[PDB]
């Protein structure tokens, strides 16, 4: 039953539903931590 | 189709058999005078072979010996072509001959380099175990004598609840026709203890070295197998002592074809023969031990044995 | 059917008739539903506007055909013969060609396997001796061609003209070859034929183009189709760099012909031209179009 | 069928009959609908061109076989021992062959477990002791082989020469192997057979490369093959930095082949030379073609 | 039937026989089709090569096993009973037994609840009191698993050595696990066993790691599986932080055994040693192998 | 067969299995390539 | 220890107390001087499985 149908296009992973701008907006967040407090406060 | 064609079939060569196509297979109405060939041609148009058909009233028949066809090769192109009298040619049959037989790719398998090995044992076990197995006496003729009132090694021998002799062959066979047997063994009593090398896998001929132990006897000897519990001496012998925990090298060397034994630690061989007509090579690599003793206990037997592969 | 003939010319020179008269006679027939084998697959482009879209072009696509064939034989073993035979017939380095005979003449596309074939059935083929091998096949020139009208014209002149009567009457544009002897100053044409791609569709209406002078022993090649090189020298000297970026910009219209004329200047022995017109079609078959 | 058998020669040197002449002996049948098991996948490129895309080569493909095989027995004790011998003949790390014998001879397979084995109906397998066991296995050299051919030369001479008959019959390119012994200095034939995959195909033609000079016990393994460096010593000692960027570079093209000659110079016990030539088939049978 | 017995040991000792002689003695019986019960899975990694791809390596992975039950009795109240005790045995945090029981002896996995089970029909389930609840279990250790094999050598000398008999029987390595005394010096085996991932196969033939002096008090157990910390003293002292880098590198291969050696030095009492073999296997039941 | 299917599929392009992990790093990687060798070593 | 070619041994020793058997069957070689020179040195070295 799991093996052959969502159960197993969960393991395929992000194949379905799953956004870009979410992501995009992850991905600038954590460039954001990273480089932030090493940025001039100038 | 205005004009008809040939039938694509095949023919079957096999090396060393007879090429035959039988004549019910070729049935029609063919007058005296009616000729058939057969041409096998390859990829570039050259002949590769002709042939002439039996052709009677009622059938074509062709039968080849196997030389003419052995140089047709797998795949190469055939027309089968039938003339009847005062007329051209017609082409029945067309098409590739396939070769239906073992296939050899190697064209030599040379013996491959089976390298040295080696092997030992030392009898802590309960019992003997699978990697000797009886001879002559047949199973359940071997068994593990503790020594506990000497304080030395387990050793095997035959089970003298009902055999007084005894042999053993080691399950694996040697990879080469020299070989190296050292045995560290004890004298408990009186018997003659045999190492047999380049033995048969049932022990009917083979090179040996006996050790005989007893009040008189303190000896050593070679010997040649005729059985497995038999043997035949070779040339003379040398007197020898066998104390507890002796070990003995026992070396077969194929060029320069000898037998030797040496006592411990010595270089030079207290007993050798050599020349001894005894067969050799593949199949006359098996070794193994044997025991005899007059009474009904333990005379001398090995507490460890270890074989290797060349000298 | 006698309507229809479908033939295979394979890789190795080998000679299958798939469907009509002697079809199967070499132990492969053509089952059917056999895909992108017609109309050349062509997409059309469009842009945003006030009304929804607006055209914006089209491009042809390779073909992508798949098609199965049967392979046939009495015994299991001239079976496998015919299979060897039909596998080797194809390749993916190099095209074989496959020709289509009908009432508007034979008309042939060149193409390779673009995977591996899919054999036999799901039990050994050698129980049936008559098993269909699934083949995808690509044709990367997607058009359906006959062969090219060829054209001479020598002369003796130091100075000459010459016309070439043309006419496109197929389907989809082609594009003119031609051979030009050295040495030798050649003018040659590129009419538009009213083509508008450039927005020059009456202002290129005649015109011509002269090659670079040519020296002695160098015979060019001049090819206007974008798939190759327009201007190749037999010698190995680089034509087309003395062309100050000139090129041949118009292919030869379905439906347009004319007497187009070429020119040699300074030709002290007097050379020769050849014009090879391709014949293109967007199908197997079609009625001539004026 | 007696036309083609199916065997296996699993890791631990078990031999399973699976189809043709005396198959099911060890209990172990094949099922079928078996797939990727006959033409080796390739993958062909393509890249934008003027008339759609144009080819621009093929990549071939692991094989993927899914097959199902199916392990009987009367009683459920000798079928589970049947069931355990089968799963032991396979393993994920170590590979064993499966070998197809045809009239065209006997060409094997290196196959892999790729994933678990999928094994027995949905109740408990005792019940019939009679269970298909689906298994995915996988090639990483996806062509069909035979068995290479060996051949030896050895000289007494401190300077010789031989020719090495060698000929491609098979359907893909093969690379060649060297052993060569030391020391001497080596010349081997590097010929391009006319491929032109570095744009040399004919000034390749008679190529041959010189091997750098090998002392005492430098005996080296010289191998085509992209998989492997090309020399190896047996020694340890890095022989490739004395070889100056050269390069065995080109395969043994399909349908090529003649006496490659191989020179050995300043070999003061003489030398030995073996040349290994694979041959490697896409189908587990084909008939010769040339 | 009576060649194989399944039973479920839940978190709370209960204990249920779900297939074989016995079954739904205690009102659950097992239904057919589950699923990731037999093989362990494992994933096979591939990179690209000169052929396709290359086998890259193996990797194991968790067991997601979805497997039915039913449970029954007469009457709706006893039946609520027995689907609150099944409910009882499972958990997420801890994980109950499944011993699977044949002729090659009795194997046990460890599972814990996935996610919620789903019971009952469509309508309430005291109409039937003949009820299936779906499971979807998962086992983080994938490998079925016997009674490890301990073996115990205990000495009053300050100076002495021993050998261990050990041999994998299981298709899995498996990794061993020591005990021993303080204070005193200890060699333990690490052998290779010919295995060679880390390109040290017989180099590390009879490879030897001298475990840190262990001060009074400070017994150790030496567990080489990579789930868990290798030394680890029973009296919280660091003695891995006095262990240089060291470690226990490779497991017993299957197929493979001898007589390990271990050595004690510098033990004015004299010390023991204990050694736990692990019985690892990937099915259920097989025969063993050599 | 093929048209209409998962062959497809394959010309719709990246609609089914696709994921933006690589994705994302091929970006960083390519705009790396770019910008490092112009990045000064101070 | 036996020198060149004699069949009675240079050097001999038993009953030194160490391990034996598998794990201690590695072989190698030392040296030791006193001076920054060359002492005794190894031209060839060869091993033997077995005796």
Same mark, same amino acid.
């Given at each position: 039953?799991?093996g052959?149908?969502?159960a197993?296009?969960?393991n #395929?992973g992000?194949?379905?539903?799953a956004? #870009?701008?979410?992501?995009?907006k992850?991905?600038?967040?954590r460039?954001?931590?990273?480089?932030?407090?090493?940025?001039?406060?100038? | 189709?205005?004009?008809?064609?040939?039938?694509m079939?095949?023919? +079957?060569?096999?090396?060393g058999?007879?090429?035959?196509?039988?004549? $019910?297979k070729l049935?029609?109405?063919?007058p005296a005078? +009616?000729?058939?060939?057969?041409?096998f041609?390859?990829? @570039?148009?050259? /002949?590769?072979?002709?042939?002439?058909? /039996?052709v009677?009233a009622?059938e074509?028949?062709?039968?080849?010996?196997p030389d003419?066809?052995?140089?047709?090769?797998?795949?190469a192109?055939?027309?089968?072509?039938?003339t009847?009298?005062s007329?051209q040619?017609?082409?029945?049959?067309?098409?590739? @001959?396939?070769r239906?037989?073992?296939r050899?790719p190697?064209?030599?398998?040379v013996?491959?380099?089976?390298? @040295?090995?080696?092997?030992?044992?030392?009898?802590?076990?309960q019992?003997?175990?699978?990697? $000797?197995k009886?001879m002559g006496?047949? $199973?359940?003729?071997?068994?593990?004598? +503790?020594?506990?009132?000497?304080?030395?090694?387990p050793?095997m021998?035959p089970?003298?609840?009902?055999?007084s002799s005894a042999?053993?062959r $080691?399950?694996w066979?040697?990879?080469?026709?020299s070989?190296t047997?050292?045995?560290?063994?004890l004298?408990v009593?009186?018997?003659?203890?045999?190492?047999?090398?380049?033995?048969?896998?049932?022990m009917?001929?083979?090179?040996?070295?006996?050790f005989? /132990?007893?009040?008189?006897?303190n000896?050593v000897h070679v010997?040649?197998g005729?059985?497995?519990l038999?043997?035949?001496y070779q040339?003379?012998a040398?007197?020898?002592t +066998?104390?507890?925990?002796?070990?003995?090298?026992?070396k077969?060397?194929?060029?320069l074809?000898?037998?030797?034994?040496?006592?411990? /630690?010595?270089?030079?061989?207290?007993?050798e023969?050599?020349?001894?007509?005894?067969?050799?090579?593949?199949g006359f690599?098996?070794?193994?031990l044997?025991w005899?003793? @007059?009474?009904?206990?333990?005379?001398?037997?090995?507490?460890?044995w270890?074989a290797?592969?060349g000298? | 059917t006698?309507?229809?003939?479908?033939?295979?010319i394979?890789?190795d020179?080998?000679?299958w008739?798939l469907s009509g %008269?002697?079809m199967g006679q070499?132990?492969?027939?053509?089952?059917?539903?056999?895909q992108?084998?017609?109309?050349?697959?062509?997409?059309?482009?469009?842009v945003?506007?006030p009304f929804?879209?607006?055209?914006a072009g089209?491009?042809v696509?390779?073909?992508?055909?798949?098609?199965?064939?049967?392979?046939?034989d009495?015994?299991?073993?001239?079976?496998?013969?015919?299979?060897?035979l039909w596998?080797?017939?194809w390749d993916?380095?190099?095209?074989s060609?496959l020709?289509v005979?009908?009432?508007?003449?034979?008309?042939?596309?060149?193409?390779r396997?673009?995977?591996?074939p899919?054999?036999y059935y799901?039990?050994?083929?050698?129980?049936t001796?008559?098993?269909?091998?699934?083949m995808?096949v690509?044709?990367?020139?997607?058009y359906?061609?006959?062969?090219?009208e060829?054209?001479?014209?020598?002369?003796?002149?130091?100075?000459?003209?010459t016309?070439? %009567?043309?006419?496109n009457?197929?389907?989809? %544009?082609?594009w003119?070859?031609?051979?030009?002897t050295?040495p030798?100053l050649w003018?040659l044409?590129?009419?538009?034929?009213?083509?508008d791609?450039?927005?020059?569709?009456?202002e290129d209406?005649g015109?011509?183009?002269?090659?670079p002078?040519l020296?002695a022993?160098?015979?060019?090649?001049?090819?206007?189709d974008?798939?190759?090189?327009?201007?190749i020298?037999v010698?190995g000297?680089?034509?087309?760099?003395?062309?100050?970026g000139?090129?041949?910009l118009?292919?030869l219209?379905?439906?347009?012909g004319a007497?187009?004329?070429v020119?040699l200047?300074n030709?002290p022995?007097?050379g020769?031209?050849k014009?090879?017109?391709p014949?293109?079609?967007?199908?197997?078959?079609s009625?001539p179009?004026?």
């Open positions: 039953s799991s052959g149908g969502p197993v296009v969960n #395929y992000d194949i379905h539903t956004n #870009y701008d979410e992501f995009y992850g991905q600038q967040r460039e954001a931590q990273q480089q932030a407090p090493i940025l001039p406060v100038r | 189709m205005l004009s008809t064609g040939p039938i079939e095949t023919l +079957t060569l096999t090396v058999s007879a090429f035959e196509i039988p004549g $019910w049935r029609g109405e063919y005078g +009616t000729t058939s060939h057969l041409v041609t390859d990829a @570039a148009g050259g /002949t590769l072979g002709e042939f002439e058909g /039996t009677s009622k074509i028949h062709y039968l080849q010996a003419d066809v052995k140089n047709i090769p797998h795949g192109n055939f027309q089968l072509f039938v009847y009298p007329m040619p017609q082409c029945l049959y067309f098409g590739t @001959a396939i239906k037989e073992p050899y190697l064209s030599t398998v013996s491959p380099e089976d390298s @040295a090995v080696q092997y030992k044992a030392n009898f802590v076990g019992y003997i175990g699978p990697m $000797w009886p006496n047949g $199973w359940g003729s071997l068994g593990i004598h +503790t020594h506990a009132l000497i304080s030395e090694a050793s021998g089970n003298y609840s009902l055999f042999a053993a $080691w399950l066979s040697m990879n080469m026709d070989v047997i050292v045995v560290r063994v004298n009593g009186a018997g003659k203890f045999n190492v047999i090398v380049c033995a048969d896998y049932q009917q001929t083979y090179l040996g070295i006996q005989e /132990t007893g009040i008189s006897n000896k010997i040649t005729d059985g497995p038999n043997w035949g040339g003379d040398v007197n020898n +066998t104390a507890n925990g002796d070990v003995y090298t026992i077969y060397n194929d060029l074809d000898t037998i030797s034994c040496y006592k411990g /630690t010595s270089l030079t061989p207290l007993i023969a050599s020349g001894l007509d005894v067969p050799h090579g593949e690599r098996y070794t193994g044997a005899n003793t @007059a009474l009904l206990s333990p005379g001398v037997e090995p507490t460890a270890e290797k592969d000298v | 006698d309507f229809l003939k479908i033939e295979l394979g890789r020179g080998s000679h008739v %008269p002697g070499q132990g492969v027939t053509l089952n059917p539903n056999l992108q084998f017609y109309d050349a697959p062509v997409k059309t482009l469009y945003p506007g929804g879209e607006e055209y089209k491009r696509q390779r073909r992508e055909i798949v098609f199965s064939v049967q392979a046939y009495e015994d299991p073993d001239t079976w496998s013969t015919v299979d060897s596998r080797w017939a993916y380095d190099e095209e060609e020709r005979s009908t009432s508007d003449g034979t008309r042939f596309l060149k193409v396997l673009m995977e591996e899919k054999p799901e039990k050994d083929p050698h129980i001796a008559d098993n269909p091998i699934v995808t690509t044709a990367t020139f997607p359906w061609q006959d062969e090219p060829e054209l001479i014209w020598t002369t003796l002149s130091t100075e000459d003209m016309r070439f %009567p043309v006419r009457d197929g389907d989809v %544009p082609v003119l070859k031609w051979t030009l050295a030798g003018i044409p590129d009419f538009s034929w009213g083509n791609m450039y927005s020059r569709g009456r209406l015109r011509t183009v002269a090659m002078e020296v022993g160098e015979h060019v090649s001049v090819d206007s974008p798939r190759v090189q327009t201007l020298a010698n000297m680089p034509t087309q760099n003395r062309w100050k000139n090129d041949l118009y292919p219209m379905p439906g347009k007497e187009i004329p020119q200047k030709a022995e007097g020769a031209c014009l090879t017109r014949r293109w079609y967007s199908r197997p078959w009625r179009g004026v």
